[PDB]
Structure formats: structure tokens, C-alpha cells
Design a binder for this molecule. Structure first.
Ligand code: BDP
Ligand code: BDP
Ligand code: BDP
Lengths: 598, 598, 598
């Protein structure tokens, strides 16, 4: 269930297996001939961690369907076999199968959340052959959802070759996305840590009480520099600090927490912060917040979706340069390292599950007996709800302690106004609120066409998150008519007395295209688009956030509607600014983190 | 009916009125208040000749609906009022209304063909106020055809503001497109000239007999330098030359023809050339030709569709640099000056009418009583056939003598496989063959989806001209499956034993986008697309021409499918080459004008 | 002296400390206040490994002068304190100072070669504060060499702010460039391994004898799959294999070598390959080789010079796509991981030292008493020779075993035709040949202006490596006059009877700029430039290699001559191909690895 971020400590090791592994594409006789038994023959090379799709040439490699085989030898000295040996795969996209010496030790479904296995038993001495098989197939049983044709459906479709058809607007990057590490710990070890914060704003000098639980199978506090200030015994626990330095947006502070438990020990950074909804206002530390930022992607060249800590730091630098304060993990949980970095740098995050494409109205829509099948058809619709809960389980269990995480997003653009939607999401929202020890807000990001009266989010969600494209897909290029439509729908959303924020809005823009009299796809049109939208946003005291789509240009599946990927970014794929980036920087510079329009 | 190209001669003048005129947009009280009576107030400035759409700023100006008013004063001395004064408007797009001193002297429908009026009667002495009103409205009665919504129909459509919606894929550039000149001539004057060529290939030294007619309301021959070689009297006439220098593709020769007729005289360049179809082979001068070139547009910045002789010469230079030999006047007759230039430089031309958009299946298709209305519905379909004939009349009457003109194109992508198509085009083809004194081939350019069995062009046309996009709109990005489909349809077209040529095929390509593993919209994909198509072309001895679409990027109406216009050009809008331009140059360099695959 | 690549084995661990460390810029009171003692206050964040220059915003950060402070806590359990604890800094650019708990444990000069220190003594238990201070200052004592003004010297120079002025044409990326890892090993351990190959081509089935030495402070062989085939005892040693699979260019093979030595063990991949010079011919495995490739940079966004294994694999993929076979480590030794990858993928490498900028004629040239100071002036010239030898020592000691390494490059563009040049390089070449157990060729890359009679490389070097820009800096834009000059100088180089190869030649090209009639900086001009140069290369049987400059666009110091960096790449900085990339791919496809022109 629970997984702490591995890190070197007094009692645990940490051996990063990152490097160039052996690699081979399934053909698809890989399992018949038991390639996991022996070392791979005719193997190519492949770095880890990284999506493999862009690291070789040819459409057959990039658009490969099925399995790939990673392989690498490992070896451990016996003088720590006394300890337990565990293998943490930070992420394998999508479906992983971990062999060792030819024996299937582990399986996992879920391309964006960590999972571990124990190695003490099957780790013979000498050099041991580790093989990881990675599958990329997506369908009605996976999150994200795979369709039956192109999402934008002219086009293709006449081919019998088996192919993935994403029901989502990003490229199906697969492989060992995130680091594969080996760490140790003593039999009887700290397995999970939880920390909540009851805090007091009555006083001019805010105090805070920190409850904690340390599941296991001394607790020291430290502040930034490491000046110790408190101590307690047992899995039991509480701290009383006065003169709390509140973790703030763009003004972070992380106390340290040292938990020694006999033969084992682990340190956890924690930020003291409060967040709660109050009618219109979205309060962080009992102050009226306003989101400024974007929906992002873990998308870089040529790593694909592979983790890129240099870019993560560069993205933060650009955000603080642009006077942003937040972003959403579109459309999947990001790496642990990026989440911890957001703690250090003080960026508000909207952590989202992998639940994109739970909407069978995209594309032409799948068909059965002539009839079109609704999204939540129990026999021919999505088969994802049970896996959907495991994702909510594993996600909250991983990022429960992050001060940056401010709200959970159950799904991106699901068919939330259709038959079966409420019964699908009600158990998910309930599980979301039951397992989050901090009871933070929950939402879902609403596709276009949704209204206040028809959205199951109008009831289940604490915050309304809209993806609206008035002036692009709907109204472009007449920004005046689009303005009227945006004001009309947005007014209707004020009926709920709930906070509203736009998590996505943008216009495809090819860096370099200009005109004094703007047309679609030019940098001028992009600025005018955001001008019109932001003008309507500023009219409604109940909109509490603007998040542009996207932060940067990113790769998608090929289609007539995608000009070498999605070009809605404020920055290019190599993080160079378009003209709209300087527009938002000037606008966001005058809008404060708190009390924008109260 | 007939209109000769005005040019300075011994008996006629030529006063180009080109310059900066007064200009004003209708609002739309222009005719109520009789703005044509007085000089215009609050007028802006506008050069002539030029499309006005891109010469000012603001969407309201560029997307203006309705009328505009040009105005300019003229004056003539009396010492040539003895002569007749005629005003030749080379082209006014679309509908022109010529006032003078407040009196409506002329009207014209047809935005791409010349028309004149006589000035002797209403030309008082002193300074006379000339006003031209230009209308841009397009609908089911105009050629090109105006629709009811965007041609690519997400989008727009919710606006009540009256707007043009082109049923064609280029921008509705309007205004005084081509020069407005004043020339003289004596009462009793040469009105029309016609020259045919019966020529003899029996001998090792080809001789030629030139019949001519000189309609009127001495005939001298001259060769290139001006060395005279023959003479004849009367409207009657014939010439017998031996050692003819045959006008060839990329090797032109223009004899001169001086026709003195009493008080009047006119000189006409003429090239001696033969063209006839023979089963598979397209013969020019009894040799098997092969078209190499493009579909072009009269499209430059910022002239819009306005005439641009510097670019016309530059385009020819680029064609001869690229080893091309031909192009089509997509999708309207081009300027006279460009046609005469093609005579001098020796470029084969496929002269096409303004009949684009005669196809109501584009867009969503217009609706009536729930029913969709077919293209040639007699009550709710196109109302263009009678105007369509006037266009065929005026066009052939203008370019009957050009040696470069090798074939006529009745329409671009009409609904030629629908009910009513044959009865619509049969009288048009008949008029085309009846009025062309040289009886040159006639065709229509067939939309995609057309087959040999279903196309009314399979019967009416001497040459089959296809617009196929296997590997772009149909099959992209799988070029292998697209190849199979292209070979399958092309084989079926060989059933007719007629010549086949592709007048359009291409892929949108944004100059600058590259990848080693190509995706759509990159320069690499564009090259691979043309490689696949050209490979299939070379397999069939009955394909006699490849014409890429387009020659250069050009402006279109705004839509999600158009990245700042149509990007299918081999060159950018400013005539800079994409990578595919060097590919075609290398391919066309090894393919000869004659006897490519015989 | 000797350093083996750390990797997990039966007896050693490997704990990658890569991650987000604490970071702070010196101001420059860092050492006065002993920031290394305590944890850093007001610290920012910084990932490791990566150059820090592009990971924050502002010119002051990017152009920082002096020191920066990395900091991170580490902890080790006692149950392996029995082993020795060593800290391998793969590279710290330029000058590193490693504190721990406040004590200076190590120092290092050399920004591109590894160095380690032992941790057993100063590693108290608990959490231990590790601090690394990095300096970026460059001058006449460092390799690469720092100047006194801009290398291209209009410009700047009027500022008193202390600044680095690279005497080289790449950006002064600094910080922890390459991974910082911790590995273990038993007291008494394998410290160094050396393997040579005496091999026999007499027989139709080539056999090979492998001598080896295992310095220390059982030996098993294995072949690709791991099928064992031989064994020997002692530091003593030899192997006799028959049916050797020769490591070939673009056809690699790596036998494995397992050396168990009591309590310790290490595995080394080795490729059996021969290389020797023979008059004109450059022989690899007794066959006449021909280099096809580029000079590269370890340069990516935003890592700067930081190691990027995803890009390294992508670069190899592009090379094999382009039909290249080799590259040079311009202008510094690359990462170990890239060298091992070249072993696996079979790319020929020209390993080069950090000796760039040993040439004081660049810029305006430094001045003293009015006099200009020559490069090797003993009082005011370069002070680098002794450090220069340590670089040759550490480099060969690291890459002595790589089969890909085929030739050593002592320096890039030194003032090799000046007074003092011979006495400067003679001891360096001697040290190069003395310490390389395989006695592979040695060279230096000759600046433009050098001739056969004036170059000290004409004598000291086994291969002549030229950097010539006929048609760019010299002759551009007249490629005809430039051709004459290139043929004239190249003919004169044939006087030596030695092999000649061009290690650099190119023309700055901004991706997107085109013209049918080419001008400098367009993609067309770049192709024509390489066409002219390659035409002259093919005329001389003694030129054995063409290596273009550069592989990809890369960052440089700002100057009027650098359009956002060096644009001479065949690919863009994000590895997208320019038109010249497809030219070289077509040319290199017809040129074989061996026997091109014999
Ligand atoms: O069309 C777009 O650009 C985007 O539209 C939104 O609905 C999706 O959230 C996003 O994944 C797409 O990339
Ligand atoms: O889609 C395209 O690029 C083109 O398709 C063809 O059918 C039309 O002839 C042309 O007008 C369009 O511009
Ligand atoms: O001028 C250039 O582009 C290059 O010239 C060469 O002499 C240098 O080796 C290289 O560092 C420069 O980048």
C-alpha cells in the first residue's frame, strides 16, 4: 500500500541501477523462447530511466506495438544480505513484468506510480540476470484509456497492423519511465509515515500541533538548518511548535522529521500548511488564494516521458520568472523528485490520477449493434473503475505528506454528464476523501459541453475545474462571439456558490508565425485569445484560478490537427518563450498569491 | 465577345491608370447617398491594381462583407476625341459597377476576366470623376461558389454578422485585381484576331500553313528579330512558311504578326505548335509529352490576388531552375501578362475557368427539409451553368492564340459523380470544343472519391486530371497503406485507355519543422510523401503528368486545418524553397520533356 | 593514477548521489564565514549532475564569476564500514574542493576527468554534511585556457566586473558536470586493469593473444552471451582465443573479462581490434579505414555540459541513421558512459585532451611592454604544460582499454607553428606514446594558417588533422576561389606521405533560412560548401577522413559572430536535421568503412 521515497540514510542503502541496459523488441516470440531465461541475443542498447520511443530511428520502432525487453545484470555482496533487499521501480509504463534468473518475481499494472518487490529470496550469489518486460498496449481496461481509432477522428484506419490508438491527446511514451533503484533496510523497518497538522490562527503568533503515525512491519524534529527543537517516543506522537513558519506559496519552509525506530531510521521533510474551501474562496493558510500557472506534461526531448530533473529545475525557474504559483499534473502523477522539489521551491500542485480517456464520445465513438455504446455501458464501456481506485489508493499513499499537494483530481475530461457517470465517480470521491489524512479538496476536470446542471462534478467536487476553449475549437477565429459564449456559461457556473478555476485554455501557436492583423496559429492570435478569456475571468469573483494549456509544446499522436504535436504551449518544447509567455508574465506580476479579488 | 491585349501601337494609345486611388468601405448607405456622384469624403487610400484585403489593419477591414468604392479623376485632351476612347478593366473581383460623373456606364460579373466600355459619349471635358464599386459577395450564383459555412466543417457559425464563406480553399481576395487602362483606336478598328496552324511533319524540314481571320467593326509576318518574310491582303488570309521553328516546351519561339487595316494596326506574337491526344500519349508537336510542374495561385504578399509581374518572372525563373515545364491556372484564369510571358519563356499552361466550388458535398452540405440538397438540385442547388458558359466564352476568346495554352479545364473538383453532373457539363464541354479554333483537349479536375466508372469526366474529357491525397488526407501518416490504395485506384483508371495526370497532390509542410523519424507537417514527411506517390506514378505508362500542389504557400480562410494558410507549397509564400523543392529539382532533372516512358 | 569505471559487482556497492542538492553562489565571503561548516542558509536548489549555468534565470547567474557551493547530506550504515568507502567524482568543472563536516578532504584541478577520495576516516556516524565548492575561473594556467577578452575580438571590454573570457569557442559551462557516486571495495582490492591484444592475421581464421596486468593494492573470460571459454591465475596472464570476432567499426563485439582476486572482483568489457599507421593508409584490423563523422560537443539543453545518456543514445542512433562511423571528443574527454556506449555500438572515437586555447594569437592577442606576447613565452605565455601532462596521464589511464578509442589528440588548434611549439609538445607526445599500452596513433588538430613546412605536427604526429574553413571564414561567399585555395594547401600536405583527415569544416547555418540562389547562413549554402570541400577531398588518396563541424548547434559566449551560439551543426541543438544532414547521409551511404579509395 504505502511507499516512502527511497533516500540514503543511516540504516538503508540506495543503489541506482540507472545506466545503459540491454534492450530488444518482442517479435512476439519473446515469451515462447523464454528470453528472460538467458541474456538477450542481437540486443540493442537503451538508457534507463527513459521512454524508449524517440531513442531510435524508424516508424516501426517509434510506433511499436506490444512488449519490449530490458535486461541488466546485478550483484550484491553478502555482508548486507543480513538486511532486506528491495527493488523500487519508480514507474514502468504501462505494464511491467519483472523476471530474475528466469523466475517471474513481480507484476504491475500502472505506468505512473511506484511499486517494489523483495529480493532476499531469489537473489543467488554471483551475477544475477535481471529482466524487465514492458508492455504498451492500451484499451478499455487501462488508465489512460486506449481507443479503437484516432482521437481526433479523413485520417487513417484502413490498416490491419495492430496499433495503439490513444483516447488521449499525448504520445504513448512507454518503457522504464522513472528510476529503478535498489535499497536496503533491517528486518523490522519503518514502512510508512503519516503527518497531519492541526494549526491555530487565533494568536498573532500562529502555533501548530503535528499528529503523526509511524506504521512498522524516537521521533526527532529539526527545522530548516537542523537546529533540533522537540522529541517524542513511540508510534504514538504529537509535536507542539510555536512561531511556526507557515509553508506558503512561493515562500516555502520545510521542517525536518527524523524517525529513529531501533535498527532503522528515515528522515521526511514536512511543511506546515492549511487548506480548506469556504463557499467562493479557496483558502490556503486561511487566506484567499488564486491559482496562476498551467497544465504541464512530463515531456522533454528525447527522454519522452522519462524523468528529467534538469528540466524540472528549469521549469521551476521559468515559473518563478513568469510569476506563476501552481500547476496540475496533467494527466498522470509526476515523479517523486518533482513533487519533493515543489515542496522545496513552494509551488502549489493539483495532483491528478491517470484517469484520462474515460470518455467514449471522443473519436467517432465505438459502435456495437449499430447503436453507439455510452461511456459507462456495463458490458461494452470502460472497465476501469476497480483499477481506477487502486490508482487513487497508490497516489494518495505516496503524496499524502507533500505540502505542495493542495487538491486531488479524480479524472481529466471524463464523460461526466452521461448515464452512469455519478455511480462511477461517487465511490472514487469517497475513497479519495476517506484515505487522505488531511481531507483536502477533490475535483474532476470537466470536458467542454458540460454545464452546471448536467455535470456530476457539480455535486461530487469541492472545486469546479473547467477545460474551455472559447476562441479556439469553439468560436475561432471570432473572439467576440466566443467572449459572449464564455461569459454565458461562466455566469451559469456561479449558480453553485463553489470555487471555479480554468485548468486548461489555450490556442495552438507555431513559434515564428506572426501578423499585425492576427490569424489563428500566430503568436498575436494566442495573446488576443488569452486577453479575451482573462477579461471574462476577472469579472467573476468566484473564479479562483487560471491555468493555461499548455506550459510547453509536447508530442502527440500524428493527426491532421496536430502540427508536430500539441502547439498550445506558452513555451516551445525546448522551453523557449513565445510572445504569450511575456504577456502572462506581465499579467501575473500584478496579481498576488492571496486576496486577488476577495 | 473578343478582347485583344492592349499595347502601344502606331494607331492606339495606352494610358495606365494604375496608382493610388481614393477608397472607402460601403456602410452600406453608399448607394442611397449616391457616393458615386461626388468625390468621396473621409476616404482612405488604396493602390490599383491590388486586392485590398491585406493593405489595411483590423479583422473588420480584411473580412469586410459587401461593397467598396474606388474613385479617381481622369482627363483627356480633345485632340484625340477624334479617336474612340475605351476603358479596359483587366479584372475586377468579383462584381464591378463603373460610374462616371454619377452615371452608371457599365456592369460586369466575373472577377478574373477582362471587360471594356466605351468612353466617347459620357466623357465631358475637364476633370471627370471615375468611380468603381466592387462587390465581394459569393453564393450559389457566382463562380467561384460561396457556401453557407466554413469549407472544412467545432469551428464558428454562431454569428449573425453577414459573412462570405468560400466553398473553396483560398482567400476571397477582392478589389481591382488587375490593371485599369485607357486605350484609343480609330472608328473602324481591328476588334479580334484569330490564327490557327495546319502544320506538316511529313518532311525532314517541317513546313507550316497559318490560317487567320481578322474581324473588324495588309497582314505582315516578322519572325523573332523582325526580319520580314511574307505578306497578304484582306481579312482573308494564309501564310506558307518552311523551316518553321516549332514553339517547344522550354524552347519557345514567337513569330510576330503585323496587321495593318487602314487607319488601325495591331501586332500579335504567335507560336507555331501542334497538340493532339492519341490514346495514352499526350502529343505536343507529334511527340509524347510529360507534364512537370504544379498548380499555382496568383497569390503574393501583400498584393493578395493582385497582379505581380516581378513575382511572375521570378516564378518562371524558379521553374526553369527546378526543371519544370508546366503549371495549371488554379483556380481561375491568370493575368494576360503572365500568359504572354509563358509564350516568351515557353511554359506549358493548363488554362482553367473560375468553376471551383460547384460541389455542395463540401462542408456539412446545405440542408432544406431535413434532406440534404444535391449539388445539381434544380431548385436549391448551384445556379451557375449560364454564367459558367460566359466564362468559357470570355476565356477562350482571350487566350485562343497563346501557344502556351495546351488544354482547357472546365472546373476544379466539381461533384462530377453525382446526379445531374453529366447534363451540367455536357453543354460546357461542347461549347469548349465549338469555340476553340485549335480544338485543343478539354478536361475537368476530379475530386477525391471519384472513380473511372462514376466520373462524368471519364466520358466528357480527353484527359483525366486527378486530385489525389493518398498519404495526407487519406492514409496519413501510414504511407505504405496509402501506397496500396493509390496503386489500386490508379490501375482502375487505366481502363479508359486515356491519358492520366495528377494535377494536385501534396502535404502541408511548415518550413522549419524537421525530424530524422518523420511525422506529418515536417519537411521530411513531405519528401517521403512525394517519393511514395511518384514511385506509383512511374509504374503506369498511361500517366503523362505530375503536377504538385502547391507551388507556394498561399492564404486561405481561417480554420483549424489551415496553419496560417495552405502550407502544401514546395516553396514558401516568399518563394523560398523547402527541402522537397530540391527533391523535385533532382527528379525532374532526369525526366525529359518528351518521350519519358513512351 | 588509474581509475576503473564504478559498477555494481559481487564485492563492490554503488550508491549514486545524483539528485537535487542545496546550492548557493559565493558572494564571495563563502570561505571567510566557512559555509562548508554548517548547512547552507538561503540556499537555492540544483540538480546533480548538470552544469548550473542555464538552470536559473538572469545574466548574473548565467555569467557568474567565481565559486558556487553544492551541499548534501549523506549517511552510511556501519555494517559495511568493514569495507573501504570511496567517493568518485566523475567530473567537476573546473576546480573542485570537497569538504566534509567542515574538513577539506580533497582538491582537484581538471573539469573533465574523474578523481576519487577515501571516506573511511572522516565519515563519522549519523548524518554527515557533504559540501562541494566549484570554481569556474579560467586563465593562462587552466585547460581549457581563459583569455583577457572575447575570443572573436567593436564588442565589449569596458567593464571592470571580473569575468571569464574563454579563449575557446564554447560556453564555460561549470558545476558538477558528471555523476558523484559512492562505491565500496575490500581492503586489498583490484585497483587497475590493463589488456593488450597481439593478434594474428596470417590465418584464414584469425587468432588473438591477450596479455593483461592486474595491479592490486583468478581471471575469467566470457564472450558476449556469457559462455565461458578460458581461465588463468595470477596478476600474470595471457589468453589464447581462436575464431576471434574482431571488434569492427559499426559491427562491435565485446568479450567479457571477469577478474576475481580474493575478496574483490570486477568485470571489464573488452573488444579485440588492431590499429596501426602505414604511410598513407590508416589501418584498423589491417584494413584501410576512412573516417565518416563529426566533431561533437557534450552540449544539450538545459543540462549544459552535464551528462545526458538519453541524448548520447539518440546521437548514436542518428549517426547510424546517417551512416557515420566516428567522431572526436571536441574539445575535452567525454563521459565514461559515452565511451562504453561507443564500445557496445561500435563507433570509432578520437579521444582528445582539454588542451584548447593554447594559442595566444586568438583575440587581439595579449600585450606587455607594447610588444605582443607569443603563445609559449616563458614568462607571460601559457603556464599549462605540467597540468597538460597530468591530463594526458589521467585520460589514457581511464580509456586505455576502450576498443573504440583509436587515436589520441594532444590539443585542439594550438599555436603549433610558433616559437616554442616543438619544445612544448615533444614531451607531451612522448608521454602519450610511453603510457598508452597499445601504442595507438597520436595527433594534434591544426589551426588554419598552418602549413606542412611550418607545423610542429608535421613531425610529431602520426596523422595530420586539419581544421580548414575554405568557403566560410576564408573565401566565403566565393566557393570557386575557396576551392582553389583548398586544393593548393591540401596538395602541399601530401608532401609528408602521412594520412590526412579534416577534423573540422563547416558553415554557420540557421535552420529555416533558404534561397534558390544561396547566400551565407542558408541551408543551401551549407550544402554547397560541403559539396565543394568534399569534391577536393575525393581527389587525394592520402586523405583518410572527413569529420564535419559540428554535429549539432551548441552554445557559445555572446558575440556578434555567434547567432545564439555556434550554428555550424548538421543538426539543431535539439537534434533535428538541417538539409545538409540528408546530403551527408546520401554521400556517406555510398562510402564504405574500409577500402574507400585504397
Ligand atoms: O486539444 C487540446 O490541445 C487539449 O484539449 C484538452 O481537452 C485535453 O485536456 C488535452 O489533453 C489536449 O491536449
Ligand atoms: O486541401 C488542399 O490543400 C487543396 O485540396 C484540393 O482539393 C483543392 O484543389 C485545393 O484548392 C486545396 O487547397
Ligand atoms: O569557428 C568555429 O565555428 C569553430 O572553429 C574551430 O577552429 C574550433 O575548433 C571550434 O571550437 C569553433 O567552434
Amino acid at each position: 500500500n504505502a511507499m516512502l521515497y527511497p533516500v540514503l540514510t543511516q540504516s538503508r542503502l540506495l543503489s541506482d541501477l540507472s545506466g545503459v541496459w540491454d534492450f530488444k523488441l518482442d517479435n512476439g516470440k519473446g515469451f515462447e523462447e523464454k528470453w528472460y531465461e538467458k541474456p538477450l541475443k542481437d540486443a540493442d542498447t537503451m538508457p534507463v530511466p527513459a521512454s524508449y520511443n524517440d531513442l531510435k530511428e524508424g516508424t516501426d520502432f517509434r510506433d511499436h506495438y506490444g512488449w519490449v525487453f530490458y535486461q541488466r545484470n546485478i550483484s550484491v555482496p553478502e555482508y548486507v544480505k543480513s538486511q532486506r533487499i528491495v527493488l523500487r521501480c519508480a514507474a514502468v509504463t504501462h505494464y511491467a513484468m519483472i523476471y530474475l534468473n528466469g523466475k517471474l518475481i513481480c507484476e504491475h499494472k500502472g505506468g505512473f506510480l511506484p511499486f517494489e518487490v523483495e529480493l532476499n529470496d531469489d537473489l543467488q550469489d554471483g551475477d544475477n540476470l535481471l529482466t524487465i518486460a514492458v508492455n504498451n498496449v492500451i484499451d478499455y481496461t487501462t488508465l489512460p484509456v486506449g481507443g479503437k481509432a484516432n482521437m481526433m477522428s479523413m485520417g487513417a484506419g484502413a490498416s490491419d497492423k495492430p496499433q495503439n490508438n490513444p483516447n488521449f491527446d499525448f504520445f504513448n511514451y512507454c518503457g522504464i519511465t522513472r528510476p529503478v533503484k535498489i535499497y536496503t533496510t533491517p528486518e523490522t523497518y519503518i514502512n510508512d509515515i503519516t503527518v497531519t497538522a492541526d494549526i491555530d490562527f487565533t494568536k498573532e503568533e500562529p502555533s501548530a500541533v503535528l499528529n503523526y503515525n509511524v506504521e512498522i512491519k524516537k521521533v526527532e524534529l529539526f527545522d530548516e538548518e537542523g537546529t533540533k527543537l522537540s522529541e517524542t517516543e513511540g508510534s504514538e506522537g504529537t509535536f507542539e511548535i510555536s512561531n511556526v513558519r507557515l509553508w506558503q506559496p512561493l515562500n516555502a519552509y520545510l521542517y525536518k522529521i527524523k524517525v529513529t525506530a531501533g535498527q532503522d531510521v528515515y528522515t521526511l521533510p514536512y511543511g506546515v500548511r492549511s487548506v480548506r474551501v469556504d463557499g467562493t474562496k479557496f483558502l490556503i493558510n486561511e487566506k484567499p488564494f488564486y491559482f496562476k500557472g498551467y497544465g504541464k506534461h512530463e515531456d522533454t526531448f528525447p527522454n519522452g516521458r522519462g524523468i528529467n530533473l534538469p528540466m524540472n529545475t528549469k521549469d521551476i525557474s521559468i515559473m518563478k520568472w513568469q510569476h506563476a504559483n501552481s500547476f496540475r499534473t496533467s494527466h498522470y502523477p509526476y515523479s517523486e523528485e518533482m513533487m519533493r522539489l515543489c515542496d522545496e521551491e513552494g509551488i502549489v500542485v493539483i495532483d491528478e490520477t491517470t484517469a484520462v480517456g474515460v470518455n467514449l464520445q471522443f473519436g467517432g465513438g465505438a459502435n456495437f449493434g449499430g447503436e453507439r455504446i455510452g461511456t459507462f455501458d456495463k458490458e461494452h464501456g470502460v472497465q476501469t473503475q476497480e483499477h481506477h481506485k487502486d490508482v487513487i489508493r497508490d497516489l494518495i499513499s505516496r503524496d499524502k505528506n507533500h505540502a505542495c499537494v493542495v487538491m486531488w483530481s479524480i479524472a481529466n475530461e471524463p464523460d461526466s454528464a452521461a448515464e452512469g457517470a455519478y455511480d462511477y465517480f461517487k465511490p472514487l470521491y469517497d475513497l479519495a476523501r476517506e484515505l487522505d489524512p488531511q481531507k483536502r479538496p477533490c475535483t474532476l476536470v470537466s470536458v467542454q459541453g458540460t454545464t452546471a446542471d448536467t455535470d456530476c462534478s457539480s455535486q461530487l467536487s469541492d472545486v469546479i475545474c473547467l477545460n474551455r476553449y472559447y476562441g479556439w475549437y469553439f468560436g475561432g477565429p471570432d473572439l467576440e462571439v466566443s467572449e459572449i459564449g464564455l461569459r454565458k456559461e461562466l455566469s451559469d457556473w456561479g449558480k453553485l456558490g463553489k470555487p471555479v478555476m480554468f485548468t486548461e485554455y489555450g490556442a495552438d501557436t507555431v513559434s515564428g508565425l506572426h501578423d499585425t492583423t492576427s490569424v489563428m496559429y500566430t503568436e498575436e492570435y494566442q495573446v488576443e485569445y488569452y486577453e479575451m478569456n482573462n477579461k471574462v475571468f476577472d469579472e467573476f469573483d468566484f473564479v479562483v484560478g487560471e491555468q493555461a494549456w499548455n506550459f510547453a509544446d509536447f508530442a502527440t499522436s500524428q493527426s491532421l490537427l496536430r502540427v508536430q504535436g500539441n502547439k498550445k504551449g506558452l513555451f516551445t518544447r525546448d522551453r523557449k518563450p513565445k510572445m504569450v509567455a511575456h504577456y502572462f508574465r506581465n499579467r501575473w506580476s500584478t496579481i498576488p498569491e492571496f486576496g486577488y479579488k476577495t
